[PDB]
Amino acid sequence: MQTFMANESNIERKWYVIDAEGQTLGRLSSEVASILRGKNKVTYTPHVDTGDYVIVINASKIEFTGNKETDKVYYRHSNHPGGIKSITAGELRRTNPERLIENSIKGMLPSTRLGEKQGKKLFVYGGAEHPHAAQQPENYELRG
Amino acid sequence: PRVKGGTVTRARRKKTIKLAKGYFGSKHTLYKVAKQQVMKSGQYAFRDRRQRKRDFRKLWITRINAAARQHEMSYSRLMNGLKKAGIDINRKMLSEIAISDEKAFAQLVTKAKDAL
Amino acid sequence: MFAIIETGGKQIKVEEGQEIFVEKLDVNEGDTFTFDKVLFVGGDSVKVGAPTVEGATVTATVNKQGRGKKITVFTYKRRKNSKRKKGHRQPYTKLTIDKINA
RNA sequence: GUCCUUUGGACAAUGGUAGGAGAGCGUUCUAAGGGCGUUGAAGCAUGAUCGUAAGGACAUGUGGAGCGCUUAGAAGUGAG
RNA sequence: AGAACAUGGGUGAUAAGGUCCGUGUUCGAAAGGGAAACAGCCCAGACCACCAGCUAAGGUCCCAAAAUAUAUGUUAAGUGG
RNA sequence: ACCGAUAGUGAACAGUACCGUGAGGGAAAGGUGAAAAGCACCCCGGAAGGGGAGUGAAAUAGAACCUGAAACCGUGUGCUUACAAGUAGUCAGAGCCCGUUAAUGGGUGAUGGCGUGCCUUUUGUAGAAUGAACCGGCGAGUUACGAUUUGAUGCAAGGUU
Numbered sequence: 313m314q315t316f317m318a319n320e321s322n323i324e325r326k327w328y329v330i331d332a333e334g335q336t337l338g339r340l341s342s343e344v345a346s347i348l349r350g351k352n353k354v355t356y357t358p359h360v361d362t363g364d365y366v367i368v369i370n371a372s373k374i375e376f377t378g379n380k381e382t383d384k385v386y387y388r389h390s391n392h393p394g395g396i397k398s399i400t401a402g403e404l405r406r407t408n409p410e411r412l413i414e415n416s417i418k419g420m421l422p423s424t425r426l427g428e429k430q431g432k433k434l435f436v437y438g439g440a441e442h443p444h445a446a447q448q449p450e451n452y453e454l455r456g
Numbered sequence: 457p458r459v460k461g462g463t464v465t466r467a468r469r470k471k472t473i474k475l476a477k478g479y480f481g482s483k484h485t486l487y488k489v490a491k492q493q494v495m496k497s498g499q500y501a502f503r504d505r506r507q508r509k510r511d512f513r514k515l516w517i518t519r520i521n522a523a524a525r526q527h528e529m530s531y532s533r534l535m536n537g538l539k540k541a542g543i544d545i546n547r548k549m550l551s552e553i554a555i556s557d558e559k560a561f562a563q564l565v566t567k568a569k570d571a572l
Numbered sequence: 573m574f575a576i577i578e579t580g581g582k583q584i585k586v587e588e589g590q591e592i593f594v595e596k597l598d599v600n601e602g603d604t605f606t607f608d609k610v611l612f613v614g615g616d617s618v619k620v621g622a623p624t625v626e627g628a629t630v631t632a633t634v635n636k637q638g639r640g641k642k643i644t645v646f647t648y649k650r651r652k653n654s655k656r657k658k659g660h661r662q663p664y665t666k667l668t669i670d671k672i673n674a
Numbered sequence: 675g676u677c678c679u680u681u682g683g684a685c686a687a688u689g690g691u692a693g694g695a696g697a698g699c700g701u702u703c704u705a706a707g708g709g710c711g712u713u714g715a716a717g718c719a720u721g722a723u724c725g726u727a728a729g730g731a732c733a734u735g736u737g738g739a740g741c742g743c744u745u746a747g748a749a750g751u752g753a754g
Numbered sequence: 755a756g757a758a759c760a761u762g763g764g765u766g767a768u769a770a771g772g773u774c775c776g777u778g779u780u781c782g783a784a785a786g787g788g789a790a791a792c793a794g795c796c797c798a799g800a801c802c803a804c805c806a807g808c809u810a811a812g813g814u815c816c817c818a819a820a821a822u823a824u825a826u827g828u829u830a831a832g833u834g835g
Numbered sequence: 836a837c838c839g840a841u842a843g844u845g846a847a848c849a850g851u852a853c854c855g856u857g858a859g860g861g862a863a864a865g866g867u868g869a870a871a872a873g874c875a876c877c878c879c880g881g882a883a884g885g886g887g888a889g890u891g892a893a894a895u896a897g898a899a900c901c902u903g904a905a906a907c908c909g910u911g912u913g914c915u916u917a918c919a920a921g922u923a924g925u926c927a928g929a930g931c932c933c934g935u936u937a938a939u940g941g942g943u944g945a946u947g948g949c950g951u952g953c954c955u956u957u958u959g960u961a962g963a964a965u966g967a968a969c970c971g972g973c974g975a976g977u978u979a980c981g982a983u984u985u986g987a988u989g990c991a992a993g994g995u996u
Contacts (some may be wrong), residue, residue, distance in 0.1 A: 492922095501643075
């Protein structure tokens with residue numbers, strides 16, 4: 313005086329549903345990353361995991377702007393000599409678009425062990441159908 | 457007369473070795489490495505006593521901002537409105553009330569809001 | 573039920589019957605100190621003091637004037653032969669609330 | 675420090691290498707005065723104690739004959 | 755044994771993180787914030803405590819605090835003719 | 836107002852062990868107890884070594900014998916650990932186990948933030964520049980005589996042998 317709530321321990325996590333139709337990849341991505349992070353709770357501490365689950369289901373009506381489809385190559389290396397591989401944004405969205413969305417969510421999260429855990433509260437589906445009815449998921453609308 | 461370099465040397469070295477307790481391996485057992493770590497940690501503590509103040513202010517501001525968007529307002533706009541109302545409550549106080557009594561926090565938000 | 577007082581250079585949330593630690597006050601042990609600067613009254617009826625609440629006193633009884641846990645302040649510079657070492661204990665006063673007025 | 679000098683109300687000040695100035699802490703030995711010790715000295719080990727720092731106590735266990743304090747003096751007087 | 759920077763000049767090639775003078779600043783001997791990291795650049799000079807407040811340079815979508823703020827315009831290029 | 840066994844003689848038990856063709860060089864190594872009363876006897880064992888029992892104020896005083904630090908090596912246990920990227924600390928902080936020179940108590944620590952050892956030498960060193968395996972002991976502005984300048988004290992046209 314130390315009069316200060318920190319002990320989030322024993323928190324209450326909920327379940328959310330966002331849909332991807334006609335949104336921008338980055339902007340949806342940043343709002344979802346904030347929810348998974350827990351930045352919207354008056355009770356927020358960075359050392360324990362507050363924050364809650366997010367379900368993305370259309371993941372095929374993702375919208376780019378400009379020439380993102382042919383540009384925006386993605387790269388990876390296999391640690392094997394000359395082993396650089398690549399794929400362009402449009403055909404990654406056309407085959408495995410779930411990877412397209414979850415990669416750009418997880419690139420917006422801390423790369424600690426807590427952050428890689430918070431990225432595991434994410435479920436992405438191409439098409440408007442998901443299995444999680446026992447969790448009682450609620451619709452959330454992008455409050456930009 | 458002749459002095460011996462006697463019992464004083466151990467006492468001085470044993471204080472540092474005790475003060476290095478809990479460190480890893482040689483860090484808590486050997487005097488030269490323990491002395492280095494015990495002076496390194498003393499310089500860490502100075503810097504980190506300064507850093508606590510700014511860390512908790514950052515946390516208080518982020519929790520008030522979370523509480524503000526619930527009542528459809530931004531942190532910056534809220535604090536400006538409170539300044540114009542004259543309210544003298546504090547970042548830490550504003551977080552502790554917003555966590556314990558939401559109904560007291562809502563009246564503050566309305567007075568901060570029609571002050572604008 | 574709870575009040576906000578501004579004492580020392582800091583603000584504290586208090587309730588009837590709890591213990592607080594503040595910067596030193598000119599008082600002796602046993603006495604009763606009364607706080608003036610009240611900023612918020614969180615009761616059934618809520619009073620907001622944008623400057624002050626105009627009234628609003630909090631009563632407390634002094635017990636244990638004391639001096640705090642000791643910290644060693646140590647700093648050094650690497651290949652320069654300068655270092656400094658000193659000790660500090662901060663004084664405090666311990667209080668228990670009995671009254672929240674308005 | 676400063677100066678009204680109520681030495682307190684203020685007017686202050688207080689990063690630092692070569693280097694200059696000040697004030698102190700501990701070690702061994704001597705003088706004088708007072709102390710302690712087989713109902714347990716010095717040394718060793720542990721503790722959550724005290725002092726602004728160098729450092730000082732006290733309790734307990736081990737040890738089995740020596741050792742503090744106050745004022746002064748003299749140095750083979752402090753190691754990474 | 756000095757160093758970088760901006761401005762005035764010689765030398766060199768209107769070269770050099772080159773070299774030689776002059777006028778300032780900073781490092782040397784200076785912790786803190788910004789420039790990703792980064793003695794010498796921008797802001798600023800640490801007696802000690804605090805889970806108080808206002809600001810500087812730089813900033814306010816996520817990492818990572820603070821405007822997905824207004825009103826009004828340019829850009830379609832993504833980061834010798 | 837000299838040293839106390841790395842000191843003081845090289846030498847407290849030696850010009851010896853040892854080294855060299857020779858002239859020659861040249862160490863390390865003190866301590867049972869007041870008194871040997873220095874452990875009769877039984878048990879395991881080829882023995883060494885141990886376990887009892889005994890003597891003693893005391894055998895973790897038993898000859899490797901006063902005390903017995905640290906490095907280093909072990910046995911047991913409270914908390915913690917097999918998705919994790921590191922100068923190993925510091926600041927925050929749950930969970931579990933405790934109970935002190937009782938006091939804003941102690942141990943350990945999921946998880947978050949920040950963070951390139953020390954000394955030397957350099958314009959500039961995390962530096963891939965130097966030095967140090969670790970721990971213990973020892974290891975570097977001194978004294979004599981003169982000179983100058985400060986402080987103190989006595990006497991003063993004198994002062995001092």
